[PDB]
Structures are given as C-alpha cells and as structure tokens.
Design a protein around this ligand. Structure first.
Ligand SMILES: O=P(O)(O)C(O)(Cc1cccnc1)P(=O)(O)O
Ligand SMILES: O=P(O)(O)C(O)(Cc1cccnc1)P(=O)(O)O
Ligand code: DMA
Ligand code: DMA
Ligand SMILES: [Mg+2]
Ligand SMILES: [Mg+2]
Ligand SMILES: [Mg+2]
Ligand SMILES: [Mg+2]
Ligand SMILES: [Mg+2]
Ligand SMILES: [Mg+2]
Lengths: 362, 362
C-alpha cells in the first residue's frame, strides 16, 4: 500500500544517514559498508512492518482530528516513521540473537542471519548488537530537539530490558527453577510442573508484549504529543493482552503452519519450549497422554516430534484456541470501550491494530 | 585499598537495587534472581577496576580544589562510583560477547562465562545483553535529576556504538576486505596486505579506546560538572593514544604473558588477529620470515602456533615495543602538558591514569 512504501522510503533515508556516518566518522571501508548494508536489509526488511506501521497508524489517527500547519503534519508523519523504524530495528536485534539461541534455520523465508555462510554465529552476535545501537543513533539524531526525546529514551530502555529479561525466562523455561545453576549443565524438566498458564503468561508478557504492542502504541502517542490524553494503565493492559494473543498465535503457527507460508521453520517442540500448545495440552491431557508427551517432548528426533504433534491434534487444541480467542476478543473490546472515554481516536487505532493481529496468518 | 573497597560497596548497592527491582517489578523467581546475581558477579568483578576507578580519580581531583558542602562531596563521590560501574558493566557486556566471538577459554582466571557448564553460548549471549541494559537502568535511576544526564546518555551511546563498530573491524580483520560477502564463507587472507599500522590503529581506536579511556575520563568530568573546563579535543587525543597503548600491551601479553599471570589464555595467533605483534613482525621481516609466518599463522595447531612465537622472539619485537613505548611516553607527556593550560587537576588525573596503565603487568 503506501503508507508502507512511504514508511520504507524513510528506511532508505535512515540507512543512508547511518552508512554515510560510518564513512564520514567511523573510517569504514566500502566493503564493510556494503556488508552492514546487506546486514540491515536482511535483518530489518521482508516482514509485515506491523510494529512500525502501528506508530504511523496512531499518529495518523491524531492528525485527522488535530489542527496543524502542513509542515507540522509532514514532520509528525516523518517522526512516526523514524520512531517506527527504531522499533523494527530493536525487533531485528532480538530476532538475530533469538535465532541463534533457538537454533532456528529460516526467518522471513530466508536463512537466519547467523546461517548465512559468510556470517556465522561469530559475526551475527555483534551484528545484532549493532542493530540495537543504531536505534539510539536514530533517536539522538532525528529527535535531538523534540520535547518527547527523554520520555521516549526512558520508555525504550525499559521495553528493551523487559524483553531481555523475558528472553531469559524463555530460554530457561524447560529447566526446573530449583536446578538452575551456572556451575551445573542444565537438564530438561521431567515433571513439566512449570508449564502452567501463569508461568506461560509471565514469559510471554516480558519477552514479547513490551516491544510488539506497548512500545509502538506509546511511540505513536509520543510523536503525536498526545500521551497525556490517554489512560496509560489501559494502554498497558490492552498492549499486554493483544501481545499475549500475538504470541499464542506464534506458538500455534510454529507447530501447525507450513514453513512455506510462515516463512520460518518451527523448533518449539525440539527446543522443549514452554509454548501455549504444551501448556494447554497439559491442562487437559489424561495420565497416559501426559506420560507419552513426557517420553517425546524436547528431542530433535523427527519421530519424537511427530508423536507430540499427533498428541496435539488428538487433544483437540483448536477447541482450546477458540475458547481462548473468544475470551481475548471479549477483553480487548472491553478495553477499547474504556479507551474511548478519553481517547476515541486512540481507541480506533487499537481497534485496527487488534483487527490486523487477529486476522494474521503470518 | 579503599577507594576500591568503597567503590565495591557501591556495586553492592547497585546489585541490590537491580535484583530487588527484578523481584518487585519483573516477577522474577528467587532461583533466576540467584542466577543473575552470580552472572553479574562473574562478569563484573575480579578485574582491576581501572575504568571505574578512573572516574573516581578524576572526581577526587576536582573535589580537592573546589568548594562544596560535605553532603555535596558525598553525592559527587557516589555518582562517580555509579558512573564507574556503568562503564565496568558496559565492559562486562563486551567481554562476555567477545569471549564467545574469540573462542576464548579463561577470563580473570576463571572459565569464560559462556563456558560455565550451566551457562553455554545460548544463555551467555542474552546475559551479555542484560549487562548492557543494566547500565541504562543505573543511569536513569541514579542520575534522573542530574544536570549531566542527557550529555552522559548521549556520550555513552556513541562510545558503545564505536565499540561495536570496532568489534566488527576486529572480528573481520583476517579476511580480505574485497572478499567480505554474507553469501560466501569467509576465507583467511593469504597476503596479509591489510595488516598495516594504519589499519591496526583504526581497529584498536574503535574497539577499545572509547570505552577504556575516553568514557571514564569524560564521565569523571560529567559527575564533577567540569567538562566545560577542559579542551575536549585534547581529552580525545590523549584517550585514544593511552587506549591504543593499552591494547598494544594486551596484544603482547596474549602471546608472551603466562596464563597464570594474565588470567586469560591467548588466542590471537590461532584466531589470525591483526595484532600489534603480527603487524610489527610484518613491518620488519625479510622474505623468508614473511613466507614462514604465512605458512603457520591462524591455525589452532600448537606446532604452528609455536613457529609463529619463535618467529616473534627471533624478530626482536621487544626492540620495537621499546621504541613504540618511548614514542607514546613522549606524546602522552606532551598532551598532559597541553592539558595543564586549562586544567592542572585533570592533567594530574591523566598523569596517574597513564602511570598505572604503563606499569600494568595485567
Ligand atoms: O520468531 P520466533 O522465533 O517464532 C519468536 O516469536 C521470536 C521472538 C524473539 C524475541 C522475543 N519474542 C519473540 P519466539 O519467542 O522465538 O517463538
Ligand atoms: O580481553 P581480550 O580478549 O584480550 C580483548 O582485549 C577484549 C576486548 C573486547 C572488546 C573490545 N576491546 C577488547 P581483545 O580485543 O579480544 O584482544
Ligand atoms: C516473531 C515476531 C517478533 C514477529 C513480528 O511481525 P511483523 O508483522 O511486523 O513481520 P515480522 O515478524 O517478519 O517482523
Ligand atoms: C581486556 C580489558 C577490556 C581489560 C580491562 O582492565 P581492568 O584493569 O579494569 O581489569 P579487567 O581487564 O579484568 O577489567
Ligand atoms: Mg525463536
Ligand atoms: Mg525464542
Ligand atoms: Mg515462535
Ligand atoms: Mg578477546
Ligand atoms: Mg576480541
Ligand atoms: Mg587480547
């Protein structure tokens, strides 16, 4: 659409500013410049731009109802795009490191960045680090004189930290808590006692929901100078609820959506993740099903993986997904209605974000 | 000494604040809290605290000559300590990721963090990420109302980025530039044409000197509200020059200092690094020596490593080190003399920092 081509045009400006800076200030050679250019394209582009386009949507909502000079309108949209790219690049940073940590093979229908032959884990770790640093270069350069600069940096820091904390909860979600010990190699849980909805909710709240929904929605408010015009407690509740749903969808897709469609190859069963499928299965299985799950979960062996998928299909988790979805539809609509008391415009943005999320097939 | 025990006491406060926050705001369980506690201790403690104690030194320099209430003095010292810990933790972040990228085995006389049995590359990548995030939590929490907060965040961002850029220059310093290509597995240089003093200087300037010398010296100025009282161009020159010397020392030590003393196990020859030894050797070798260097460099094979060390010993690089050191002594003293025109107190801090650096055996 544009909107999205216009958003991508701002990516072009940001890439040129970043790479011209590397040549002019960081003594970079043209071949390392080209490597960082392809790195940025491979890691930042080719997705749906949900996060970045969410900040644009929120900004456009307020521009429709607020009086501004034309030049001001132009500035607000451009700030929305740059703010949207900071999040897309923060996401890029997490996905590069996540793919290494998850042992994944494909991202956005291409090899994970670390699996590019001329990349490898060694470089990719540091390239993911660079992606996050570029987010701060963008912010300091583009928003230097903006009133919202300090609030934005502080919120960005907290979202980032929550995400890294969340990634720790995730990567250790298959170990017994009482057995974590840097000194002792971590064995997988045999009881699965920590595969509960509460624990699942905590992992997901931190690892995903701050950056996929909370940050973009509040960033759209910041660039609009409209933050004080919403109830922040409601923004957070609805972010965390739509975020959790987004991650539940991701978990279902990891197992059940063909890689040609999804653009990734699922690893949750083999990595022994505390996914929504595993928790929900365990929430309804009889003693024999639990037993068979335990004998097959968290192994690379394709025959073992197939048994778990069979257990999932037989357990009729599509009923559970339907009942979970219907509950979230209830809760999201209820939050949108509460948002409209102070912010009809922001509520409608949340409605659109919800609608796009709910219908994605990724 | 104290000074350093007092500095470590501030580490205790910062750790407690961070871990109490994780329990109170991030829903952490006591066993993950304990893992992050040992992670922070293993990665942040046990070194010499040169960086952190440099900010304390600079602050103490100004307190001696400036009138302040007692309570103000106390606040400035505490800010110097917290600012010193931000750098120590930024360093901790780089060393955790660097040890993975370098395939190193020992750090501060213990296993590299990623080699702890109960850690592994998978966790350690994300733990290094957390270490840097904690630097921003510290800053926002402790310096929230300080006049220097914005300058400090902006300088911290730029030092960090320069370091990550520098780490890219380092990790790729053994590939031919014209052959870098994410699509093609990177072969080692056979001509060594990019092992030059200019290229060496650029790698070292970015990967090391911003965070080891520039940041702590300017941080001491920031917490002292004294930045405007020095010539920033001189601070940068002297930082970058003492930083380069510090890294040359590190390179010499990697090959020639026994691991029991150094607290690390050298990998530069096996990793094919553009070290000061390799560049300097190539700066004086005859055609046969160059030939033999090329037949042995950048291989894990202990017999090959021993040949390179033999070539280094025979090449009398201790003459070259002596001539390089004598030159830097000249240049550093000259910079200190220039610093004294506006800043006798800061010049004396630089003199102490230089003296401590020059005499280290690490
Ligand atoms: O894209 P992925 O790998 O399916 C995922 O959503 C990626 C991701 C990375 C970081 C935080 N949240 C989600 P995950 O949790 O790994 O299943
Ligand atoms: O401690 P190391 O590994 O000797 C080193 O100094 C560590 C280091 C990490 C990051 C930036 N600068 C130096 P290196 O460059 O790897 O030789
Ligand atoms: C797994 C994850 C963090 C997905 C974000 O979705 P997107 O619609 O913006 O497309 P992409 O996922 O490829 O960024
Ligand atoms: C290699 C490197 C970045 C060293 C810093 O020196 P330090 O004196 O402060 O002790 P440690 O090196 O262990 O931090
Ligand atoms: Mg993943
Ligand atoms: Mg993951
Ligand atoms: Mg997934
Ligand atoms: Mg190293
Ligand atoms: Mg290194
Ligand atoms: Mg070294």
């Amino acid at each position: 659409m544009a909107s999205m081509e216009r958003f991508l045009s701002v990516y072009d400006e940001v890439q040129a500013f970043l790479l011209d800076q590397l040549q002019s200030k960081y003594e970079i050679d043209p071949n390392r410049a080209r490597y960082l250019r392809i790195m940025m394209d491979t890691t930042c582009l080719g997705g749906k731009y949900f996060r970045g386009m969410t900040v644009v949507n929120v900004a456009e909502g307020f521009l429709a109802v607020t009086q501004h000079d034309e030049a001001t309108k132009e500035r607000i949209l451009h700030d929305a795009c740059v703010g949207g790219w900071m999040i897309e690049f923060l996401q890029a940073h997490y996905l590069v490191e996540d793919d290494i940590m998850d042992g994944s093979v494909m991202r956005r229908g291409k090899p994970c960045w670390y699996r590019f032959p001329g990349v490898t884990t060694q470089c990719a770790i540091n390239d993911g680090i660079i992606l996050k640093s570029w987010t701060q270069i963008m912010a300091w350069h583009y928003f230097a004189d903006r009133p919202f600069l300090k609030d934005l940096l502080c919120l960005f820091q907290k979202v980032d930290y929550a995400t890294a904390v969340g990634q720790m909860y995730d990567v250790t979600s298959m170990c017994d808590s009482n057995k974590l010990d840097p000194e002792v190699a971590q064995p997988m849980t045999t009881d699965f006692a920590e595969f509960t909805p509460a624990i699942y909710k905590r992992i997901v709240k931190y690892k995903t929901t701050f950056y996929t929904y909370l940050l973009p929605l509040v960033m759209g408010l910041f660039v609009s100078e409209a933050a004080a015009s919403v109830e922040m407690n409601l923004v957070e509740r609805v972010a965390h609820l739509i975020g959790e749903y987004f991650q539940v969808q991701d978990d279902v897709m990891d197992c059940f959506t063909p890689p040609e469609q999804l653009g990734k190859v699922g690893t949750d069963i083999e990595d022994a993740k505390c996914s929504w499928l595993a928790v929900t299965f365990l929430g309804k299985a009889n003693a024999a099903q639990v037993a068979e799950f335990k004998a097959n979960y968290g192994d690379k062996d394709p025959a073992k993986v197939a048994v778990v998928k069979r257990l999932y299909s037989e357990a009729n988790l599509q009923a559970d997904f339907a009942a979970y979805e219907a509950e979230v539809v209830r809760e999201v609509e209820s939050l949108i209605e509460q948002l409209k008391v102070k912010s009809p415009t922001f509520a409608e943005s949340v409605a659109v974000v919800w609608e796009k999320t709910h219908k994605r097939k990724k």
